[PDB]
């Protein structure tokens, strides 16, 4: 049974390995189906427990990842794709 | 630059710590605000890389956490609250 302090510290706004669908992050790229179709990205998650504030990134960077980009009825080929990561996170006024 | 196998193997369907909103998990608790508002739960996360399959739990288990339960314009008190956890995740069809 998880003591309140521990719940609080672990849920509070911070960068966390999130699994993010490639098609969400690249809305327009329609001629491809991705394998894996999702990737591990460091993104801000959690809560600020304060009506005025919200969890948002304050330092961002990119990471490039080999992805099998499959073109239906055609073929497939490895290729690089870049994605936004969050290095730092803070609770800021809305 | 993350090599293919590395990405696939790290985004494959598995239990990942996931920050989940308490209100979403308990829609019936209209008269409380929660502090923290979200909790870290292990939950099925990734993708299965096939549209014949889907990421689902095969082994569940509950964990109790201490949540601070605010009744708006009234008061607040600490309380225990149970949440569902995914212990083993596997790739299934419909």
């Amino acid at each position: 049974v998880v003591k309140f302090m521990d719940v609080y510290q672990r849920s509070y706004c911070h960068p966390i390995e999130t699994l993010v669908d490639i098609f969400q992050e690249y809305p327009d790229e329609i001629e491809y189906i991705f394998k894996p179709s999702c990737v591990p990205l460091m993104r801000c998650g959690g809560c600020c427990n304060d009506e005025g504030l919200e969890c948002v990134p304050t330092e961002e960077s990119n990471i490039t990842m080999q992805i099998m980009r499959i073109k239906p009825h055609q073929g497939q080929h490895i290729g690089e794709m870049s994605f936004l990561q969050h290095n730092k996170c803070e609770c800021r006024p809305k | 630059v993350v090599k293919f196998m590395d990405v696939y193997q790290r985004s494959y369907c598995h239990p990942i710590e996931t920050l989940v909103d308490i209100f979403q998990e308990y829609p019936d608790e209209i008269e409380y605000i929660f502090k923290p508002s979200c909790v870290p739960l292990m939950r099925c996360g990734g993708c299965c890389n096939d549209e014949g399959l889907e990421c689902v739990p095969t082994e569940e288990s509950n964990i109790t956490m201490q949540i601070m339960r605010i009744k708006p314009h009234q008061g607040q008190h600490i309380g225990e609250m149970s949440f569902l956890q995914h212990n083993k995740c596997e790739c299934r069809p419909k």
Partner: antibody
Amino acid sequence: EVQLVESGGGLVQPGGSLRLSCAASGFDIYDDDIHWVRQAPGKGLEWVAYIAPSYGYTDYADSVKGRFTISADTSKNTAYLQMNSLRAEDTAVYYCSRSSDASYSYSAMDYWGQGTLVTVSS
Amino acid sequence: DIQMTQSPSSLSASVGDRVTITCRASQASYSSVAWYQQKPGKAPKLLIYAASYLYSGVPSRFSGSGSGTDFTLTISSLQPEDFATYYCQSSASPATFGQGTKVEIKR
């Protein structure tokens, strides 16, 4: 014009090793898709391995994983196949081939060597 | 591996015929195919990739069709040159071959 020339075939005895070479001219193997397809006598084509050297990515058929190793030396515009732990049924003409970028497909094998016989027998 | 069955395994036609080779694949519906020709004592030569697309230099007499699971090669008017063994191949991982379909001449 594009050329793919194999060598290093010959005798091997069971549980022994032998490296296969593939000398490429007319194109840069580092940015390319190189394959090895083999074929036992009287029998059909089996795909055996694949490299995209600039991606550092290799794939193999399940019938050779653990034993075989495709690689490439950029400086020698040559690809290799290290074959270890060879049983008798690995006896085959071994082609090296490529898929050029005329096909998006990584596996639409477009140019080919003349092949090289490898006999595994005691 | 992945399984690739070819039907028929062998054949017997004459010059001028219509020919149809089928190809079965244990692969996703989005995964495509290639077609090769191989004559005795020689290397194969790519005919068609991406199911339907004519690799340059290949006579129009050849064309392709099908998708996902099942695939059909088609020679409209068979020629003396067209007597060979024809293989199909997955364009996925692994990129496994079919077992080959021999066209022998009819006497």
